[PDB]
Design a protein around this ligand. Structure first.
Ligand SMILES: COC[C@H]1CC[C@H]2[C@@H](C)[C@@H](O)[C@H](O[C@H]3O[C@H](CO)[C@@H](O)[C@H](O)[C@H]3O)[C@H]3[C@H](C(C)C)CC[C@]3(C)C[C@H]12
Lengths: 233, 8, 226, 7
């Protein structure tokens, strides 16, 4: 039940597609107050993303049912859909607050000044899981967590711009989700198009710097950046 | 589809 | 708290892929002691099939990793943890069969009795996949009696081209192959049910003909694989 | 599997 065994369990849960156990195993490894390896860092992020992704997918389906049958006939059935939707939000908000707690207590705190890659990695997770909370929010509760995601992306944007190559996967992934936060959340298409094209052109300027070790990860995000830029114009 | 980077 | 909304909740859980909630809603509908309709019976079946199916896939992946490979003791622990969940889901649906579903089936509801006896044999066969020692022979004899009783009822009071009768023969052949390890008994029932279905294949039931031909394709694909 | 896989 040591650190090596918990990572082995998280590897098994990913093979068994039991992402709930995978996120629970990597949560305990995070709670060991030790730095996370690049493999352990990716397994922790993949686990919670699939867990929160399952609740987001279920929420979009049920919320679409409410938008369709707003006041169509039976009102008691809408009460069942509303309580089912609010139960999904309670599970989604609990998973997000679980990730945001591990970041600001075990991951961001343990990051040194020289660990720029791990700092931008965890800062984008804070911006992502706060954006997911902004997806489920109304009134002041939305803008309260939107600014929490605005400060998480903008801070990582200033850090990853200086001490990181423009062709780095974490750099491109940060600019991708940041443009998504500017488009879907803030309804600012001009800010998203400019930010996406800026990181895209910055990556094109140094295409010769791609190493044979990790290049498909970089080309995939650049392809996603070009796809979103083509449909946003 | 989702415009964000999906974590495969 | 009513019956109609629990069925609506099960439909919403199916479209949200929350099969755990779906199996819970149909469990409450079944626990209302009222016989399930054709759609409600399929909702309960599909729900627990996806629930026990996800546990079987995770068990088969962990078992294959334990076979291909301080590091093993944890794999065996993750195996028994999934086994505990798999056995809990099986004993849950098996209790719904022996108390609510089969009990409310008269001796003349042949189509419903074959469906529930096949389901009893399926989830007892699922227990035979993870049981060891005398616990295996106990649930294998239970799955045998459930499949045998369902086979005799469908052999006499049912049509050879019935999809439920064909699906029963498919799972009965799978039981004889993957559990009893008797490919002679497995291919015998599959070929017998296939020949009896082809003999009356010209009827082409307008109600559901694609479902009948699809199960024959599954019987045909199993004959090619074996 | 080889069994009748439902929806
Ligand atoms: C919170 O933002 C963090 C993401 C930002 C950048 C990205 C880098 C680290 C990337 O390198 C990772 O990819 C590694 O993990 C895979 C499998 O886990 C390997 O296929 C692969 O080779 C390996 O590089 C990816 C990934 C690629 C694009 C398909 C999806 C998200 C993930 C997991 C994390 C992060």
């Amino acid at each position: 039940v040591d650190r090596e065994q918990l990572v082995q369990k998280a590897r098994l849960a990913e093979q068994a597609e039991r992402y709930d156990d995978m996120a629970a195993a990597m949560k305990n490894v995070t709670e060991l107050n030790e730095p996370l390896s690049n493999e352990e860092r990716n397994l922790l992020s993949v686990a919670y993303k699939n867990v929160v992704g399952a609740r987001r997918s279920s929420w979009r389906v049920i919320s679409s049912i409410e938008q369709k049958t707003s006041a169509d006939g039976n009102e008691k059935k809408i009460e069942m859909v509303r309580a089912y939707r609010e139960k999904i939000e309670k599970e989604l908000e609990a998973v997000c607050q679980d990730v945001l707690s591990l970041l600001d207590n075990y991951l961001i705190k343990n990051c040194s000044e020289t660990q720029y890659e791990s700092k931008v990695f965890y800062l984008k997770m804070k911006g992502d899981y706060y954006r997911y909370l902004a997806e489920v929010a109304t009134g002041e509760k939305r803008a309260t967590v939107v600014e929490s995601s605005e400060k998480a992306y903008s801070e990582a944007h200033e850090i990853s711009k200086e001490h990181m190559q423009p062709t780095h996967p974490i750099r491109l992934g940060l600019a991708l989700n940041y443009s998504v936060f500017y488009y879907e959340i803030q309804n600012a298409p001009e800010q998203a198009c400019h930010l996406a094209k800026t990181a895209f052109d910055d990556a094109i300027a140094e295409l010769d710097t791609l190493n044979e070790d990790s290049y498909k990860d970089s080309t995939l995000i650049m392809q996603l950046l070009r796809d979103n830029l083509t449909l946003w114009t | 589809r989702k415009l964000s980077l999906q974590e495969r």
